[PDB]
Write a structure and sequence with these properties.
part of a larger assembly; 6 chains; A: mainly beta; four-stranded antiparallel beta sheet; 1 helix; about 5% helix; elongated; B: about 110 residues; alpha+beta; binds fe (ii) ion; Baseplate J family protein (chains A, D); XkdQ-related protein (chain C); YqbQ/XkdQ (chain C)
């Protein structure tokens, strides 16, 4: 995150990727409550709201902060989101 | 059936007037209360201006240093009367975009 | 059955009464037609007179004031002495009185309270609509301003509210009627109409104001096709606001029922939640006609279509 | 209040705290009619419209005017609003 | 007859919105791609500017 | 009934065009006769301009005096080519407000 120092980004806040006609926005929810620190930034863990490998987005794709918390300037995802397992394969289950 | 046509024409004028409201350039005047746009009941206390209107009233740039030592060529650039910043009582042109007003600048009569 | 006027009782002269309302209508409308002999001509009914219609309510079978408004217009025939009225509740005053107001960011309930306080309109405890509206400057009628902010409140996830007058102004949520009446038992005739006329499957928001909010939120593109719209409102100044506006616009097209009832359910009004068959629908429009046989006709529809069209 | 001298602030005017995505703004109604003085300020009494402990907001929080009044520059509350008792609990009443 | 009035009002809003499009002052931001006007899907790669903005 | 719809649509276009007339920014060119706005049959002989367009063509401010006696540091500030006052043949942008035209300023093509 990036924004005014002292601003509190609460747990349950929602962030999304940019929507396009080909792909809809992929939502993510923040798991932690923190305050923007002396660097005017803060790193918070988040999970994809929807299960599946679609949640494993690439770096920099999550730029839209869905809400409206005042004082927050911009966001970005440095790491590609990981996990997001799909249904187990038929052959592996066999 | 003329009554329906008259009522419908009144609706035409109503809808067109509502659509044209809050759009296009408009005149205004600055007050202590804030911006006062012509055709508006209330003064706008929060508005934007063009950055060329924010010039200092005096000495808006030091503009060079050309020598030092033997002589000291250095100066300051006074603001001309035309480019002075906004002050109370200035007739200005304002661009209306819904609830976001932008003051383009002052207005004066045109010489031949 | 009882038409009080100021002092008299002109229920002994009326050929028929028709109580009609629309979900987006100006006011609850009563159109009472009278014969005008010497007796009725003496009292000299003028525009601005206060009419109160009292009839045995369907709920408890007690005489209750089903209409309380003002005579907005009188039309008198001379060859046949038939005086005809068209009564309106006092929301018609708000739809005619223009005024300009500048508003900061706030909710619809606060704005409605401000309008009532400014214009000295009595009002009950107004329900907290909750949704927070963007700063705007208005010029249209007071009812126009109220409808505009209520539409902007329906957008951003707020509940659908409608303003009805009665004696003192009331902020009536749509799906909050006390009794969910079932019309199938008295169903003289119904007209189930379905369509894609106003179907919205996609919406491409193009924000005219910053938080560069742009996105697409297509909801059923695979099924009905990409029936796309473009919402380009300045009031949307937020990503969540854009998403909620998009979500408050998707629908499967027009889906209404033109219901005709052989018995007049007296307390039905626009926006009420009523049942036909197992399903439940919201009253888009109701038109009672209290002739010698009470009768009612209704136009009802689903929540999604109503939100898409009237909000 | 803070604004141009001579501006008339009337009884019944509503001034509220700052609404957020989380909180509804807490409404306060002025109890007096006064004019802004030579100090381009004036002190006006008010009460929370909603009775309860919620009305006992902190100083500096009541900062939003509902209905725009020309000449008013800004508003604030120097002291925390006091009183605002809620309904007595059933246990204490018992 | 309320349906006709509603349809006609929708036509009022449609025609007024179409007429107001491409008219009046609007905000914008400059990008490497070109001008990016608020309320427009695409960036304008060819645009004019006032001559006082072309100063060195 | 299609004829009624077509006539009504013609009325829609008529009313919208009439409402949009005399509103919004428009291009124009200066002539000896006066302002010549694009889309207007006649030249406007009385119009307003922004005060920043009324700068002198040469030496629009003396801008300081920095020394006297031993040396005499004092200067004049020539107008740049961009900020010169209006002259005949200048393509300009004009704000249309009914029968009151305001010339915002000159217009030129944008570099990359
Ligand atoms: Fe010098």
């Amino acid at each position: 995150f990036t924004g005014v120092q002292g601003t509190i980004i609460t747990k349950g806040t929602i962030v999304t990727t940019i929507a396009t006609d080909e792909k809809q926005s992929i939502e993510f929810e923040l798991l932690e409550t923190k305050t923007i620190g002396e660097n005017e930034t803060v790193d918070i863990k988040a999970e994809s709201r929807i299960v599946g490998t679609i949640g494993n987005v690439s770096k920099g794709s999550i730029s839209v902060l869905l809400g409206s918390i005042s004082g927050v300037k911009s966001i970005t995802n440095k790491e590609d989101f990981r996990g997001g397992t799909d249904i187990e394969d038929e052959e592996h289950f066999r | 059936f003329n009554g329906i046509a008259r009522i419908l024409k009144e609706n035409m004028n109503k809808s067109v007037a509502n659509g044209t409201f809050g759009m296009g350039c408009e005149l205004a005047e600055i007050t202590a209360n804030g911006l006062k746009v012509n055709g508006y009941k209330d003064e706008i206390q929060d508005y934007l201006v063009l950055e060329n209107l924010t010039l200092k009233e005096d000495y808006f740039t030091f503009s060079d240093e050309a020598l030092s030592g033997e002589y000291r060529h250095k100066h300051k650039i006074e603001t001309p009367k035309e480019l002075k910043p906004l002050r109370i009582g200035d007739n200005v042109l304002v661009a209306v975009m819904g609830a976001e007003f932008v003051v383009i600048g002052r207005v004066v009569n045109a010489k031949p | 059955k009882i038409i009080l006027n100021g002092k008299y009782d002109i229920a002994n002269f009326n050929e028929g009464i028709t109580l009609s309302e629309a979900i987006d209508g100006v006011a609850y409308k009563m159109d009472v037609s009278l014969v005008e002999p010497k007796q009725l001509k003496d009292i000299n009914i003028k525009k601005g007179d206060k009419i109160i219609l009292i009839d045995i309510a369907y709920e408890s079978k007690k005489e209750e004031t089903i209409f309380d408004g003002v005579v907005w217009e009188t039309r008198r025939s001379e060859k046949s002495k038939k005086l005809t009225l068209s009564c309106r509740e006092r929301t018609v005053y708000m739809e005619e009185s223009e005024e300009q107001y500048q508003f900061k960011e706030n909710t619809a309930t606060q704005r409605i309270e401000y309008y009532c306080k400014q214009w000295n309109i009595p009002y009950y405890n107004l329900a907290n609509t909750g949704k927070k509206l963007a700063k705007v400057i208005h010029k249209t009628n007071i009812l126009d301003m109220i409808k505009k902010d209520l539409k902007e409140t329906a957008t951003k996830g707020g509940d659908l509210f409608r303003v009805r007058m009665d004696n003192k102004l009331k902020l009536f949520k749509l799906g909050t009627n006390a009794n969910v009446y079932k019309l199938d038992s008295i169903l003289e005739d119904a007209n189930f109409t379905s369509s894609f006329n106003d179907a919205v499957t996609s919406v491409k928001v193009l924000g005219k104001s910053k938080d560069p909010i742009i996105g697409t939120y297509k909801k059923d593109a695979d099924k009905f096709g990409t029936l796309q719209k473009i919402k380009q409102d300045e009031k949307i100044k937020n990503a969540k606001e854009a998403k909620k506006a998009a979500e408050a616009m998707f629908n499967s097209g027009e889906e209404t029922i033109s219901v005709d009832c052989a018995v007049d359910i007296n307390r039905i009004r626009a926006g009420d939640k009523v049942s036909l068959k197992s399903k439940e629908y919201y009253v888009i429009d109701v038109t009672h006609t209290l002739d010698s046989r009470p009768k009612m006709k209704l136009n009802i529809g689903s929540l999604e279509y109503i939100r898409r069209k009237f909000y």
